[PDB]
Symmetry: D2
Subunit: 274 residues, 4 copies
């Protein structure tokens, strides 16, 4: 019965147009998808940007273009920019777009092996990013891939480095190298978070095949849900999705079947302390 906030992670850094022909790459494509997602029930867009050639971008001008396009089509949507970017990107380039003063942005809470590579978040870089969030008055969404990252975040809170309260945690489950999205895991994580950061709220992203199991557990445990091509390009096993909005709409339908209302924009901002 608690409202449900749906996030659409519409582009990401890695997904190709060859694999997912409906992948939005340009600001205009991203705005069109954001409108469809909003109408389907999404209240947050998790935003990565691309150059026209499809390579990942960290350019401030390009971020401003995408943010402006999305805002103009759906002024009420929450635009959450990524500070993760493409694995391997320099930390300075990942941090810089906070200067655009978005409403929300991601804050990655640890390092992990990530497929064939390593997604690096050095402890000193986490601290400097956390300080930049404060300086630009941006509300973090803290990305957690493993149990230990919750404790790490709790220590940064204790030290006064992360002062946001309530803090919003995004469990990102199913990375090869990170915690999987099996139900035991999501239950463990929400309970672990409740022990360590009792006032934190949470959402879950389930990569690939973990999208459905994470979503259905979150539905009935008060959690919020992320979906989209950044995490999963398939609507069913072996069946490419038509759009990010198709993925959002399924979650909206399930919420309607079970009687869990979707958050209004106002409710989403209240819950996320925006």
């Amino acid at each position: 019965h608690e409202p449900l906030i749906l996030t659409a992670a519409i582009t990401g850094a890695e997904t190709t147009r060859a694999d997912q022909p409906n992948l939005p790459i340009t600001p205009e494509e991203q705005a069109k998808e954001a409108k469809a997602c909003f109408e389907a029930g999404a209240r947050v867009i998790h935003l990565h940007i691309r150059e026209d050639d499809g390579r990942p971008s960290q350019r401030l001008d390009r971020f401003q273009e995408a943010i402006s396009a999305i805002r103009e089509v759906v002024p009420e949507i929450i635009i959450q920019i990524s500070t993760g970017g493409a694995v391997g990107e320099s930390f300075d380039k990942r941090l810089a777009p906070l200067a655009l003063k978005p409403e929300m942005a991601t804050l990655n809470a640890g390092t992990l092996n990530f497929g064939d590579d390593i997604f690096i978040n050095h402890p000193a870089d986490i601290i400097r990013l956390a300080e930049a969030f404060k300086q630009y008055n941006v509300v973090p969404e803290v990305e957690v891939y493993e149990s230990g990252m919750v404790d790490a975040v709790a220590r940064l809170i204790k030290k006064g480095i992360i002062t946001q309260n309530p803090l919003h945690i995004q469990f990102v489950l199913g990375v090869p190298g990170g915690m999987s999205g099996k139900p035991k895991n999501l239950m463990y994580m929400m309970e672990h978070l409740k022990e360590e950061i009792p006032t934190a709220t949470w959402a879950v992203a389930g990569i690939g095949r973990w999208h459905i199991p994470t979503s259905l557990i979150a539905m009935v445990t008060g959690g919020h849900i992320r979906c989209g091509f950044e995490d999963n390009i398939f609507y069913h096993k072996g069946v490419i999705a038509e759009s990010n909005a198709q993925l959002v709409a399924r979650l909206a339908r399930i919420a309607k079947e079970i009687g869990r209302p979707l958050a209004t924009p106002e409710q989403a901002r209240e819950i996320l302390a925006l």
Copy 2:
């Protein structure tokens, strides 16, 4: 992966306690139960969990009335599995609860313990559990073992060790949300499936969520390989404060959610195979 695990839906259409005053759509007579069973089957149900009533709504244990209901359902929907309750109504004698196994249904419930049950006690004395287990062997009926608490899993495992229950694979029905029993919160259903895997590794399972626990138990079962029971016996509401129109309406919602997520419904043949009814 859920795309490869057939889902068995059970409709517990009548029960012992639900009233026509609370749920105007409650099926009471054999004819009414047959009609509802057919609609439930068409909506995706493969098992009916059957209690019977007299025409005036009183719970019954009579063998003639059980046969009337069984035959009515079989005549219109022979494909569905008719699972007889041996739990019956509040305070019923154990003799009357056991007797209908002599009708040789495909399946019947075997309650695995005693618990406080609302304002009363649902009594299953250890010696009676044993004689009921013996009756399942005598009459060649497959049990569905009803579990309301952790310790009932251990109790069943002891009966298996003692050779009192030899059915393998054994089917366990978690019944969660009784006032006096374990609730249907997600932590609990996760705990129970994992506990069952430790104690009875080859057992299969279903969950029934009483009242407000219907939705949480169903969605967890969807994505953990469990099977799902619904129906007026357990829950008369489609949403909080919104009475369900029929048992089939409840079944159809579960079928729609399964279809959304790509989990196939068991065919009658698959339901019988999974439950070891052939």
Copy 3:
């Protein structure tokens, strides 16, 4: 951190079922119980969970005999907390189980549900649970609420919501390992403490592990802030196949383990504060 959580040890010295034939060292008479209570206190126990017996070993509920035992224990060890059982023996009437609250002990048990209990049923009808809860208020006695299954936690939480139990903080005693109840495996004790934290956030807890579950429950409790019950009522063996020499021997082992790990034993004053007995 365990170095800062006092540990309350309870000795359940006699019980209703344990026999002198199995355990030659079992204390039966008030004098024997007093001697054992003193030795247990010296070994680290702060609470005695008291059942009484007639001289021939039969379980008793008589108020004159309860007063005799209580007084005998108080005379030699006034510091120990004497917690009266209201569970009593197999099949005992609820009237006789309730009556000793009129003796106004510091603490008494309040059994939170019915369960199969070995070959019998331990009956706690919902209406009787309520009238016992009412008696705790009438006689100004603090309850220790005995929980054998998950659903009993929910039942207690409902009585708190209804204002039937107003004791706060409430002390819960998990009793794990009864045949018919939840076992004392580590998964279970972890689940139960976490479930209790969700449902009754301010409750404190202890664990009793019947038989082979004594060691697993004790070591988990040591490092999770729980308190620990031991004694012949629950377990007559020091090791598998090795009879315990006394209840104090069991208490002393727990005290030694606490000392090894640096967890302090509660003083009598701390035990009373924690249990809200002042």
Copy 4:
């Protein structure tokens, strides 16, 4: 009732002689400590080496000296060499001592932030180390700091990269950056491992204040236990330990109190598939 294998991690890479005056640094000191630990109940020594000045070493000659000294005092002990070394050490230097053909050695299963630094185990380096274990016929002890590392190891098993069965996993709990040693966590990890790698055996190391909680849970769940100055220099809060053997002996006493037998050398080798 199942036998208990105690491991003594006697030296490590970071502990100083100033903080723990009884820290063994030289091969001779390490041999003396190993004998005392063996007599107290230890069946495995987890071995890091130091130069005489106390800096961490990866020199093959120095490893051979330590291995020889320990072997000569207690021929029956199992000598498990570390391939973790000091955080920041080159992977080539970490891998090289496998050429000495020890009975067992550690195999770190992932990257994590580790205090102020990052303990790096690139996916390609994990693979090459796993292949070297096979080439030198060394049995791994696989070090796991987070849930996701279990899945990662399971994938390497599926691919035939890790073929050891039964595989021995060491949960290392309490690193700042890794999973903590709280009871919920250890219970979760043993159950998660049972789901993902059903025939694996396990031990736990609890860093610092997590030594006691991890040990007592392991005692009664069939797990094995690591202790020692590498992980914890305190016998009680604020009370420096006298020796690694003191730490081992407490665990032996608790095992004796509860009736869990210590593994004989033969039993330890059987359990660990040596």
